[PDB]
């Protein structure tokens, strides 16, 4: 409810005995995601704002965000109850949140 | 969402830019998001953790006191299961807090 | 069941053969079944009711103290709505108890 | 859960400014019902054990128990979550509970 807005928008996460990291987005659309990094990740801010892409990968096909910078978000768990009135609209907002989270992780110093 | 949480580690310790407090997600029952807070004189070394749930202060909110310097508050429940029996429900919420408290002393 | 409760009066005061304590059903949010208990020196005449929720005694259970002689305990929640925000949830549970307390002084 | 079994099996209810009464059954099958009385109700124990009947009445058709003694139970709200494996089996157990509640109301003195 209002209660999520007591929290910061982006929470960056970590668990013991785990190499992947974690993120919580507390504004709409709200979610818990797994944050991972591949070989093309270096951690530095790119010249142009983060412009990732979000799509289905793996078998079975599950939604994934690729920052195109080596940072991935995956295993999304939606924390709101709502059915999006428009899927493309909802996908667009999820991606914007994801770009913001990716950019936030790089500024995390 | 009932079981998707099980792909996640039980306890996720979190942080946020510009914030002093910390954050936890508990991904087993009962699942929740909470704020991690700390006393000034919080040592961190180690009887097993026996905290307690309570409504503290005059802000009228539910907090958890580890009694070892760590607090959990602003509890957001994430499960979809209705708990009729409150008996399990606060006890298990306090039991999970005692685990988050131990796991964070590290 | 989400709304069928609305065909019922908000507060149902109950009794049972062979039992000293009494019983209440609250049929609006938050909906619950509870046990009504009484101090020995409970007068019953009448500031509006401002009780408090608490975990009392060493039995580790959630009770409500009207502070006017009436208690509610053994809370069984009956709603099907998940309350993420605990902030409303205990406050409203305590607000409903303050109403059951006033309504039973009669 | 176990928590219902802290309560007595049958709770007889009343509300302010209401003429109908109310009942909670705390054993399986668990429910909240409205308890009403018609003109053939006198309140005394009949010679043979209560043998009511349970059926659909009104428009729309909603489940009702008639004690055949003037006591009715209606507006059932089921308090358990389960789907009965067998409807006739479940109906049978609901009626037995209802006979027991009816008989309990008469002994309530």
Residue numbers in the entry:
A (entry chain A), D (entry chain A): 5 to 113
B (entry chain B), C (entry chain B): 4 to 49, 52 to 111
The paper states:
In this work, we investigate the mechanism of activity of anti-CRISPR protein AcrIIC2Nme. We show that AcrIIC2Nme functions by inhibiting loading of the guide RNA molecule, thereby preventing formation of the active CRISPR-Cas9 surveillance complex. This interference is mediated through an interaction with the arginine-rich bridge helix, which connects the REC lobe to the NUC lobe.
To better understand the precise mechanism by which AcrIIC2Nme inhibits Cas9 activity, we determined its crystal structure to a resolution of 2.5 Å using single-wavelength anomalous diffraction (SAD). We also created a mutant lacking the final 12 amino acids (Δ112–123), which were not resolved in one of the apo crystal structures. The crystal structure of AcrIIC2Nme revealed a highly negatively charged surface that binds to the positively charged bridge helix. Mutation of this electronegative surface decreases the affinity of AcrIIC2Nme for Cas9, resulting in loss of anti-CRISPR activity. Mutation of three of the four amino acids that make direct contacts with the bridge helix (E17A, E24A, D108A) displayed a complete lack of anti-CRISPR activity in vivo while the other mutants showed changes in activity of less than 10-fold. Circular dichroism spectroscopy of the three mutants with abrogated in vivo activity revealed spectra similar to the wild type protein, showing that the lack of activity was not due to a folding defect. In addition, cooperative thermal denaturation curves and melting temperatures similar to the wild type protein indicated that these mutants maintained stable, folded structures. We conclude that the negatively charged surface of AcrIIC2Nme and the positively charged Nme1Cas9 bridge helix comprise a critical interaction interface that is required for anti-CRISPR activity.
